[PDB]
Design a protein around this ligand. Structure first.
Ligand SMILES: NC(=O)C1=CN([C@@H]2O[C@H](COP(=O)(O)OP(=O)(O)OC[C@H]3O[C@@H](n4cnc5c(N)ncnc54)[C@H](OP(=O)(O)O)[C@@H]3O)[C@@H](O)[C@H]2O)C=CC1
Ligand SMILES: CN(Cc1coc2nc(N)nc(N)c12)c1ccc(C(=O)N[C@@H](CCC(=O)O)C(=O)O)cc1
Length: 186
């Protein structure tokens, strides 16, 4: 119903995951930022929806499942029912959005956040319309097995700043990263 957004942490080499997990050691403030961005609703009495592929859901520690204070939807064409803890199961990205306009959720949901698989990002990315990409740039190489798709700079513009998002280089466990926001409308 509100805004459609993607959120991702990528290494210098475009890597997002290795063996079902993150390619770098745990970065707690990066995690806190993920949580803060997906969780904050811009409107009273509304909640954000988080859309993720099946392998992303299973990579969140069980004790954090479902992500608290968010509506959790899992995408899969193989599952019959949402996995244990999940609220909704959709067979495609169109259906997950079509569901949003269902009287059920229609008045409950503010923003919609895509929190991954590459598969999921690739598709959201080509979706027609207004979209924002929140990209945490991890500034080093990390051996990965799953990568984020290439951002087309002829369609996405890097914003010079964004309210509530730090513009300076962060550092944790001696890993430098920075937060970026890109916008499209076509
Ligand atoms: N650094 C970061 O920001 C992020 C890192 N990660 C990490 O990346 C990896 C997760 O990877 P990835 O393989 O890309 O997995 P996804 O989470 O995208 O899982 C893909 C599975 O999900 C379902 N699916 C995906 N896209 C769709 C669609 N459009 N319609 C329907 N079903 C879909 C299918 O399930 P089925 O086979 O059941 O049909 C497919 O097998 C892990 O290593 C994880 O830890 C994940 C997200 C963000
Ligand atoms: C593999 N993923 C995707 C993921 C991790 O880091 C990211 N960072 C960004 N910037 N985007 C993403 N999509 C992710 C996730 C794994 C676990 C949790 C998780 O445990 N989340 C808790 C917060 C835990 C904390 O305190 O860090 C939550 O409430 O979101 C989230 C995402």
């Amino acid at each position: 119903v509100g805004s459609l957004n993607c959120i991702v942490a990528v290494s210098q080499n475009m890597g997002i995951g290795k063996n079902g997990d993150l390619p770098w050691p745990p970065l707690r403030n990066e995690g806190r930022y993920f949580q803060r961005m997906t969780t904050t609703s811009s409107v009273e009495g509304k909640q954000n929806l988080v859309i993720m592929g099946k392998k992303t859901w299973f990579s969140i520690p069980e004790k954090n499942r479902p992500l608290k204070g968010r509506i959790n939807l899992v995408l899969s064409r193989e599952l019959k029912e949402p996995p244990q803890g999940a609220h909704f199961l959709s067979r495609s990205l169109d259906d997950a959005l079509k569901l949003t306009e269902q009287p059920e959720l229609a008045n409950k949901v503010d923003m919609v956040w895509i929190v991954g698989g590459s598969s999921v990002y690739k598709e959201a990315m080509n979706h027609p319309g207004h979209l924002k990409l929140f990209v945490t740039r991890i500034m080093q190489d990390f051996e990965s097995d799953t990568f984020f798709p290439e951002i087309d700079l002829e369609k996405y513009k890097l914003l010079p700043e964004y309210p509530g998002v730090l513009s300076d280089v962060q550092e944790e466990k001696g890993i430098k990263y920075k937060f970026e926001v890109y916008e499209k409308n076509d």
